[PDB]
Amino acid sequence: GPVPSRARVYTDVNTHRPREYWDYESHVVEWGNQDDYQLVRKLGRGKYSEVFEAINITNNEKVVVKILKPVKKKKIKREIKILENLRGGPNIITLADIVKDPVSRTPALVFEHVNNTDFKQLYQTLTDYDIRFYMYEILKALDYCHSMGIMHRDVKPHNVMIDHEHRKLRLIDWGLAEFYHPGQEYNVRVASRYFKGPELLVDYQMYDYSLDMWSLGCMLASMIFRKEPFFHGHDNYDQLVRIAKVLGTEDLYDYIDKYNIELDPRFNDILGRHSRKRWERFVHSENQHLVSPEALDFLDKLLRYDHQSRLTAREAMEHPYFYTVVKDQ
Numbered sequence: 001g002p003v004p005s006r007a008r009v010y011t012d013v014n015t016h017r018p019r020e021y022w023d024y025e026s027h028v029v030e031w032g033n034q035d036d037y038q039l040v041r042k043l044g045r046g047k048y049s050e051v052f053e054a055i056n057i058t059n060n061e062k063v064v065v066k067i068l069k070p071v072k073k074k075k076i077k078r079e080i081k082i083l084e085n086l087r088g089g090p091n092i093i094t095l096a097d098i099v100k101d102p103v104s105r106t107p108a109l110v111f112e113h114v115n116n117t118d119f120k121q122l123y124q125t126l127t128d129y130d131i132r133f134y135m136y137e138i139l140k141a142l143d144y145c146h147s148m149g150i151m152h153r154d155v156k157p158h159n160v161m162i163d164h165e166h167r168k169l170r171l172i173d174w175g176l177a178e179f180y181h182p183g184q185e186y187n188v189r190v191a192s193r194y195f196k197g198p199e200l201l202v203d204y205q206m207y208d209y210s211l212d213m214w215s216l217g218c219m220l221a222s223m224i225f226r227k228e229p230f231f232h233g234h235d236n237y238d239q240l241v242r243i244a245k246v247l248g249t250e251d252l253y254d255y256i257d258k259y260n261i262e263l264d265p266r267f268n269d270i271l272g273r274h275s276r277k278r279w280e281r282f283v284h285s286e287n288q289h290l291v292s293p294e295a296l297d298f299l300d301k302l303l304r305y306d307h308q309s310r311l312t313a314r315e316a317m318e319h320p321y322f323y324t325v326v327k328d329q
């Protein structure tokens with residue numbers, strides 16, 4: 001069978017807490033009054049929810065409402081619990097209330113309101129310094145949630161929100177997040193394809209917070225190289241080929257060895273044989289101003305098949321890539 005794995009950091013953090021903290025199945029939900037909020041306009045449709053801008057008529061404060069589509073109550077209790085646990089944390093979205101339509105029986109999450117600067121405007125103006133800063137800001141949120149025994153499992157640009165006018169960032173969409181418990185086997189059918197770690201793709205279920213660090217590298221790549229998505233797999237199998245065509249098949253077979261992982265008979269056809277490529281080959285004139293020795297060192301140390309050899313969030317925050325941003329503090 002597969003070799004076990006535990007987290008190198010924040011391993012026993014949920015164990016040292018009361019059971020209620022992570023036994024979300026037991027959480028009873030504090031309902032608010034739906035008539036305190038009126039919906040203004042729709043902001044987005046999104047697989048598990050629809051998102052609206054609303055006003056709280058109690059204090060005339062602008063708000064965000066995610067009306068949920070039908071999920072199991074235990075997954076809602078999960079998200080609510082994780083949000084409540086992380087509330088007040090750096091760059092974590094703030095849950096403000098929870099309400100149910102007394103007729104449709106549909107439940108709705110009410111959030112603080114953050115203006116998103118227009119994608120086009122932001123993307124075209126970004127700058128290396130800006131990327132550094134906002135990555136630092138994402139790392140802050142991740143080290144916080146990891147320290148609080150929680151893995152997001154859906155880190156990607158969709159779930160990051162930036163108000164550039166106020167240099168303000170939030171990490172959202174906590175509905176796939178789970179509590180890390182050593183020895184636990186998780187579902188590998190999580191996150192979107194382009195951001196899935198190797199461990200999900202080879203079906204190693206004793207994963208941990210380091211899953212987030214892979215995605216974060218997947219994010220950094222697309223930004224510095226200006227290629228979204230960076231690993232563009234046609235299906236879950238081809239996603240690992242895309243990764244192997246860059247990272248090389250050798251470190252991959254070394255990883256499945258160390259963890260005595262059994263590859264579906266399929267991959268053993270498509271994976272083939274692939275040298276580990278150098279980053280220079282994704283550099284061109286239009287991205288060079290984002291790419292730097294510091295950045296490629298940072299990226300290399302996140303994009304590793306072996307989850308145990310990835311940088312932790314706190315080590316990442318200590319990386320030379322962010323030396324300038326930390327001095328502003």
Ligand SMILES: O=S(=O)(c1ccc2nc(Cl)sc2c1)N1CCC2(CC1)CC(NCc1ccc(-c3ccccc3)c(Cl)c1)C2
Binds near residue numbers: 123134135173223
């Ligand atoms: O209208 S929504 O559905 C909405 C509105 C309010 C709301 N409030 C709660 Cl509560 S949930 C909710 C949902 N919608 C807004 C727009 C998004 C999707 C959701 C977030 C945007 N993020 C793109 C992005 C992320 C990171 C970077 C980046 C920049 C520099 C270094 C690294 C990364 C860049 Cl360049 C771009 C796309």
